[PDB]
Design an enzyme around this catalytic site. Sequence first.
Site, PDB file in Angstrom:
ATOM      1  CG  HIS A   1      -2.103  -1.003   0.971  1.00 26.38           C
ATOM      2  ND1 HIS A   1      -2.043  -2.301   1.431  1.00 26.38           N
ATOM      3  CD2 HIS A   1      -3.252  -0.913   0.258  1.00 26.38           C
ATOM      4  CE1 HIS A   1      -3.101  -2.970   1.010  1.00 26.38           C
ATOM      5  NE2 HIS A   1      -3.850  -2.152   0.294  1.00 26.38           N
TER       6      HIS A   1
ATOM      7  CG  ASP B   1      -8.097  -1.277  -4.695  1.00 26.79           C
ATOM      8  OD1 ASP B   1      -6.894  -0.907  -4.584  1.00 26.79           O
ATOM      9  OD2 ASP B   1      -8.779  -1.636  -3.713  1.00 26.79           O
TER      10      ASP B   1
HETATM   11  C1  BYE Z   1      -2.962 -12.693  -1.742  1.00 29.15           C
HETATM   12  C2  BYE Z   1      -4.250 -12.336  -0.997  1.00 29.15           C
HETATM   13  C3  BYE Z   1      -5.432 -12.326  -1.971  1.00 29.15           C
HETATM   14  C4  BYE Z   1      -5.297 -11.135  -2.905  1.00 29.15           C
HETATM   15  N1  BYE Z   1      -4.779 -11.313  -4.150  1.00 29.15           N
HETATM   16  C5  BYE Z   1      -4.594 -10.234  -4.988  1.00 29.15           C
HETATM   17  O1  BYE Z   1      -4.101 -10.397  -6.103  1.00 29.15           O
HETATM   18  C6  BYE Z   1      -4.952  -8.968  -4.540  1.00 29.15           C
HETATM   19  C7  BYE Z   1      -4.901  -7.690  -5.079  1.00 29.15           C
HETATM   20  N2  BYE Z   1      -5.376  -6.860  -4.123  1.00 29.15           N
HETATM   21  N3  BYE Z   1      -5.697  -7.485  -3.089  1.00 29.15           N
HETATM   22  C8  BYE Z   1      -6.105  -6.906  -1.934  1.00 29.15           C
HETATM   23  C9  BYE Z   1      -5.289  -5.945  -1.351  1.00 29.15           C
HETATM   24  C10 BYE Z   1      -5.665  -5.334  -0.158  1.00 29.15           C
HETATM   25  C11 BYE Z   1      -6.861  -5.684   0.456  1.00 29.15           C
HETATM   26  C12 BYE Z   1      -7.678  -6.647  -0.127  1.00 29.15           C
HETATM   27  C13 BYE Z   1      -7.303  -7.255  -1.322  1.00 29.15           C
HETATM   28 CL1  BYE Z   1      -8.362  -8.410  -2.034  1.00 29.15          CL
HETATM   29  C14 BYE Z   1      -5.477  -8.806  -3.267  1.00 29.15           C
HETATM   30  N4  BYE Z   1      -5.645  -9.894  -2.469  1.00 29.15           N
HETATM   31  C15 BYE Z   1      -4.501 -13.367   0.106  1.00 29.15           C
HETATM   32  F1  BYE Z   1      -3.442 -13.372   0.960  1.00 29.15           F
HETATM   33  F2  BYE Z   1      -4.645 -14.600  -0.449  1.00 29.15           F
HETATM   34  F3  BYE Z   1      -5.630 -13.047   0.793  1.00 29.15           F
HETATM   35 MG    MG Z   2      -7.520   0.495   0.480  1.00 27.24          MG
HETATM   36 ZN    ZN Z   3      -5.772  -0.186  -3.003  1.00 25.01          ZN
END
Ligand code: BYE
Ligand code: MG
Ligand code: ZN
Lengths: 320, 320
Positions: free
Chosen positions: B67, B217
């Site tokens: 982030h 996002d």
């Molecule tokens: C790796 C995580 C899952 C996941 N995969 C992504 O590619 C991705 C992209 N953004 N994002 C995300 C980022 C921040 C908050 C929520 C999400 Cl959803 C992701 N979360 C985990 F570990 F498997 F849960």
């Molecule tokens: Mg956020």
């Molecule tokens: Zn974000």
Amino acid sequence: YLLSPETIEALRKPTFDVWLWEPNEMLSCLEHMYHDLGLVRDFSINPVTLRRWLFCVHDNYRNNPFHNFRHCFCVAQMMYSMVWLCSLQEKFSQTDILILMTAAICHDLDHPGYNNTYQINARTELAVRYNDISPLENHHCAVAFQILAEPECNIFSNIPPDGFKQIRQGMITLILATDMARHAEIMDSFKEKMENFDYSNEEHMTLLKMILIKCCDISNEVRPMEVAEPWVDCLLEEYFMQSDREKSEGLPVAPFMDRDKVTKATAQIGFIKFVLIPMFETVTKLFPMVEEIMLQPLWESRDRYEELKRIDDAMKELQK
Amino acid sequence: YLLSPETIEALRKPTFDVWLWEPNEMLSCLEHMYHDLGLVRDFSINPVTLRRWLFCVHDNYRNNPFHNFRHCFCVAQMMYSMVWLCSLQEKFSQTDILILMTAAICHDLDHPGYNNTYQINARTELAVRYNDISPLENHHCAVAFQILAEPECNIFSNIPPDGFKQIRQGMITLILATDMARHAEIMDSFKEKMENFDYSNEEHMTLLKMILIKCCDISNEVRPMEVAEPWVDCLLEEYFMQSDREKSEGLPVAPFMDRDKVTKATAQIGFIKFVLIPMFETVTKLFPMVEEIMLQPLWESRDRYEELKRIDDAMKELQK
Ligand SMILES: C[C@@H](Cc1nc(=O)c2cnn(-c3ccccc3Cl)c2[nH]1)C(F)(F)F
Ligand SMILES: [Mg+2]
Ligand SMILES: [Zn+2]
Ligand SMILES: C[C@@H](Cc1nc(=O)c2cnn(-c3ccccc3Cl)c2[nH]1)C(F)(F)F
Ligand SMILES: [Mg+2]
Ligand SMILES: [Zn+2]
């Protein structure tokens, strides 16, 4: 600060005269309520912490003509009255009773004296901080938990974490529910559930608690005319402070806050007839004893103000 | 410090290698986007303020493994790609485009590296301030407008107040919409509206913009494998940092953040099949070109992770 047994008896009725006492005295009445409702007992509240917390809460209210510690006391006292009048302990758990009383006491914490419209229109720190989403109510609630975050003022210290989460969630819901901007919305959800209310349905109960704190918050006209009337002047006093400032800063002014448009009579007639009476009517379907104790004085308040307006018309007509 | 015509050209495709650039080059790409979409033109954005603002924005992003400012550039760049891929300028007003681009750029301002669940469970100052209601998103949004409140960074200074209000409300809605805890709710609402979508229905468009920023996002996996993979490790780095802190503080830990249960492969397979693909699938029903440019790489990404899972499971048998 040693409530006489006569005072302890009148403290359970909406007829109680909130103007006779001073902070210290009201602080004791509030303390009494927590013991009397058995909250101190069932939540293992340290009786001393409860005292500090109440001074803690008192210090965080500002000296506004209306949104002050006395208003907070009124709401908590009216809530207390309703717990007896409607025998709420037969319907609600001790947890909900705690939520109702604590929410009532903290609902207007650190109120600045200028409503959400002013905050939003003037783009204040609160408005920016809360992205125009009920900035005041959000703040009140935040100040409330900041206080409960001080170990010395944490009357909830002896409650397991699972309980705290349920109490916190509940208080937040109720405090945020006092934003009048949500009045129509809340009233509808409630009137809906009412078609077939169910004290076992958690959503019904939440709406009910939301309605209950809403009634207490604006229940001034339910009290005796001698007690109720001066509150209207305190509110208008605060409102005019806002309108003057808005006029000065070039911000829009609400009609009901403009000295040259709002008259106590006309204002209260509509407030009573369309906001107050209808709300308490819905509640009387679950608690019939309410009609006699709270609707009754509301009908008298309405009529009194209607007659009071005829006098104003005839009087102004007489001057032109 | 300058962008080559090849770069400017590539900036329009989701295959853009976001890793090849430094803050100052990204700021320049963001700048070009505003000029190119006609936002500088249609909103009289002082071109100098645009750069000052992009800088204020950069300064307010923290150095988290995920982030951070680069992430915000990813979202803004993907949004930009979609404006072209789906010819959004034929369905959306320039105000909508402005809201989309500015919200994407500001959606994670001042992120601390620990999600809402940590904030709430640890009862941090943020969770207390926002009464456990999307504390982070609310915060990102407030920082965004605190930034815009400083005249030197105010890219909206030449927009009349009515416009500012509409843009502010729009940005708030989109940023708060990025909280994944609301993912199911939003998808349901959108799919409902999708039963007979109407580009002239305001409620329809608000949901579409919410879905669009959500798509941007969490779109890392749409990008080429080489560009997307490193983001997953970055997110996990941040997640393990949280679950570490959570275990040594007594707070619960999310299974997907649990070092002992989460494997990059298994996690992405689920995230890709039950969140990403479904979301872009319903979007494709509105924009057909989206299937080939974005749903295709997601299928590949899914297949590659499924293969990596077999290899992974084998080697972890041995590490025993
Ligand atoms: C790796 C995580 C899952 C996941 N995969 C992504 O590619 C991705 C992209 N953004 N994002 C995300 C980022 C921040 C908050 C929520 C999400 Cl959803 C992701 N979360 C985990 F570990 F498997 F849960
Ligand atoms: Mg956020
Ligand atoms: Zn974000
Ligand atoms: C006097 C106002 C109307 C009004 N009458 C009340 O008795 C009352 C009690 N609380 N309350 C109130 C207070 C603060 C915010 C909102 C309300 Cl609703 C009230 N507002 C005015 F001027 F006519 F509009
Ligand atoms: Mg209030
Ligand atoms: Zn109040």
